Ligand binder design. Structure first.
Ligand SMILES: Cc1cc2nc3c(=O)[nH]c(=O)nc-3n(C[C@H](O)[C@H](O)[C@H](O)COP(=O)(O)O)c2cc1C
Ligand SMILES: Cc1cc2nc3c(=O)[nH]c(=O)nc-3n(C[C@H](O)[C@H](O)[C@H](O)COP(=O)(O)O)c2cc1C
Ligand SMILES: Cc1ncc(COP(=O)(O)O)c(C=O)c1O
Ligand SMILES: Cc1ncc(COP(=O)(O)O)c(C=O)c1O
Ligand SMILES: Cc1ncc(COP(=O)(O)O)c(C=O)c1O
Ligand SMILES: Cc1ncc(COP(=O)(O)O)c(C=O)c1O
Lengths: 199, 199
């Protein structure tokens, strides 16, 4: 139908929820999958996909290994971008914001909700580091599977999460003749300013 | 089946071609769609999706408006990342490289291959700038549609392209227990060094 300004909610999260909901409703693969880009110390951007696990006015949350590249990069530069690749629905959602570490309480809560085998997996992988063979991973997995026996499988100290603040949220929706609809929500003192951007 | 080092081609492009081919073969939406991330002058990364239009040992090519945000950003920092979001196939391809402008000859060649209405659209949109209403776009479109009458519709001077060099190419493929396969191809003097990365 198109995207007209007069139909936009004041809070970008309202619009995001609808699009997310419809994405699940359309059974797209991993509707919560978002591309998170970070920057290293030399000005070089880096990307990898992560899963959005929670969101609210404070920002969007995802979990990762604290010794990974994305983590090292965020510690040197917290500015990150998030892009939800919903093009099968002719849609795109981009977020600009600052990443901050979640508290152990939050992390513990979420970690103990993941499939056991997944919790064990968390222990196995020294994310982003070069390993000489896949076998290293599989061996540790088995070793830990029984070591724990799963008394409850502990939260690794190198596992955490980040919350990305909402400073800017862009919505994109397909248009014919290459003339798409773009609306940029810009935080401006707890309030949002909306502008249509040329496609 | 999995991804073992012994099965990797020496040239990462060989592996990329197979995965791209299979992606089209699987009828994923826009198999050529890739997320391109750039960095602004403040260290802030930015993302938007663009279409890969050509690739070879020199790098990956895509077209865009030369006055856009991505273009301004590339002019200040040419380091870019490219991520092909093929997660419906439990796959991921990430490229690190430098973006460089294509020559007018190349651009002219590709531009005149796009649907007429698409060529006209190129003229209409001052990409990334704030516009007060969608009507601005539609009006110009009609005005230009007949202005040109389409004698051939000229190449706008503000339309171009970039080629991103292949300095690093990462392949990711789903694994159970969160233990995925990751291989990072690293340019090292016209040659490629391969390392498996912890997931
Ligand atoms: C659909 C999908 C979901 C993923 N979710 C996560 C996630 O939530 N956290 C994570 O650390 N890695 C996740 N990954 C793997 C990452 O893309 C990446 O390989 C890993 O975090 C290491 O990135 P880094 O080396 O840039 O730090 C996911 C991959 C796919 C394809
Ligand atoms: C599937 C798909 C393909 C796209 N391909 C391109 C492209 O090749 N070139 C382009 O300039 N914009 C393309 N866009 C629109 C961009 O994502 C973006 O909105 C536009 O280039 C402006 O980005 P910028 O403001 O960061 O410069 C595409 C969008 C989608 C969803
Ligand atoms: C390395 C890694 N960590 C975390 C996740 C997702 O978190 P969870 O296992 O709690 O669904 C993924 C999903 O693919 C992943 O690959
Ligand atoms: C699975 C895993 N990841 C990360 C680390 C430590 O991270 P780093 O060596 O980058 O300080 C460890 C240390 O034992 C680990 O076992
Ligand atoms: C603004 C813009 N430019 C270019 C393209 C793709 O190039 P082409 O029209 O030659 O297929 C797209 C595709 O969605 C686009 O949205
Ligand atoms: C469609 C379009 N894009 C871009 C520009 C110029 O770009 P900028 O104002 O950022 O120098 C023009 C100038 O006429 C234009 O017509």
């Amino acid at each position: 139908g198109g995207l007209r300004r007069r139909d936009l909610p004041a809070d970008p999260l309202t619009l995001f929820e609808r699009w997310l909901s419809q994405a699940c409703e359309a059974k797209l693969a991993d509707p919560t999958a978002m591309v998170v880009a970070t920057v290293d110390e030399h000005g070089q951007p880096y990307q990898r996909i992560v899963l959005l696990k929670h969101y609210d006015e404070k920002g969007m949350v995802f979990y990762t290994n604290l010794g990974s590249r994305k983590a090292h990069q965020i510690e040197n530069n917290p500015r990150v971008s998030l892009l939800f690749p919903w093009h099968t629905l002719e849609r795109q959602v981009m977020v600009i914001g600052k990443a901050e570490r979640l508290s152990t309480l939050e992390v513990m809560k979420y970690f103990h909700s993941r499939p056991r085998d997944s919790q064990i997996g968390a222990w196995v992988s020294k994310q982003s580091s070069r390993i000489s063979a896949r076998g290293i991973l599989e061996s540790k997995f088995l070793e830990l599977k029984q070591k724990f026996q799963q008394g409850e499988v502990p939260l690794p100290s190198f596992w955490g999460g980040f919350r990305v603040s909402l400073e800017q949220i862009e919505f994109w929706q397909g248009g014919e003749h290459r003339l798409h609809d773009r609306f940029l929500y810009q935080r401006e003192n707890d309030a949002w300013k909306i502008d249509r951007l040329a496609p």
